[PDB]
Design a protein around this motif. Structure first.
Motif, PDB file in Angstrom:
ATOM      1  N   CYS A  85       0.507   3.457   3.701  1.00 25.24           N
ATOM      2  CA  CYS A  85       1.063   2.851   4.949  1.00 25.24           C
ATOM      3  C   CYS A  85       2.311   2.003   4.653  1.00 25.24           C
ATOM      4  O   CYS A  85       3.184   1.932   5.540  1.00 25.24           O
ATOM      5  N   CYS A 101      -4.279  -0.192   0.568  1.00 25.04           N
ATOM      6  CA  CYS A 101      -4.982  -1.236   1.346  1.00 25.04           C
ATOM      7  C   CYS A 101      -6.410  -0.750   1.604  1.00 25.04           C
ATOM      8  O   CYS A 101      -6.633   0.471   1.542  1.00 25.04           O
ATOM      9  N   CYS A 127       0.873  -1.206   0.000  1.00 26.38           N
ATOM     10  CA  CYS A 127       0.000   0.000   0.000  1.00 26.38           C
ATOM     11  C   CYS A 127       0.895   1.236   0.000  1.00 26.38           C
ATOM     12  O   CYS A 127       1.794   1.280   0.845  1.00 26.38           O
ATOM     13  N   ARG A 179       0.722  -2.914   4.496  1.00 24.65           N
ATOM     14  CA  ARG A 179      -0.389  -3.838   4.143  1.00 24.65           C
ATOM     15  C   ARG A 179      -0.492  -3.964   2.627  1.00 24.65           C
ATOM     16  O   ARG A 179      -0.118  -3.047   1.888  1.00 24.65           O
ATOM     17  N   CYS A 219      -6.674   1.869   4.464  1.00 23.02           N
ATOM     18  CA  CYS A 219      -6.119   3.192   4.071  1.00 23.02           C
ATOM     19  C   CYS A 219      -7.063   3.876   3.090  1.00 23.02           C
ATOM     20  O   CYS A 219      -7.365   5.043   3.318  1.00 23.02           O
TER      21      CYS A 219
HETATM   22 ZN   LIG Z   1      -2.495   0.903   3.827  1.00 17.80          ZN
END
Ligand SMILES: [Zn+2]
Ligand SMILES: [Zn+2]
Ligand SMILES: [Zn+2]
Ligand SMILES: [Zn+2]
Lengths: 58, 58
Positions: A8, A28, A5, A11, A31
């Protein structure tokens, strides 16, 4: 890129930003959802996030 | 998987089968659309195809 992702980086990219009949996969689900709740735009095309689908591969 | 659409095996998995707020990515947009028009079920979970999103990875 099997990269994570973009927000972040912690993930997988399983948060599909839907605008009409096209979707963008850069973030993700968790997010991409925060983006929609905080009224941010799609980072790919800066177009409003109409909905977010939790996407599973195979 | 970097493997192709499970049906045609000739196009990438960019056809996201949406059911509620979750999606399944095993088929190309064109293959996954034919499934919806011919009232087939999602091959992953045999649940009805509510919509198909043309998905772009970034
Ligand atoms: Zn994320
Ligand atoms: Zn977008
Ligand atoms: Zn196909
Ligand atoms: Zn399914």
């Amino acid at each position: 890129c099997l990269e994570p992702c973009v927000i972040c980086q912690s993930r997988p990219k399983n948060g599909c930003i839907v605008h009409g009949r096209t979707g963008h996969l850069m973030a993700c689900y968790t997010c991409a959802k925060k983006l929609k709740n905080r009224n941010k735009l799609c980072p790919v095309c800066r177009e409003p996030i109409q909905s977010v689908v939790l996407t599973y591969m195979s």
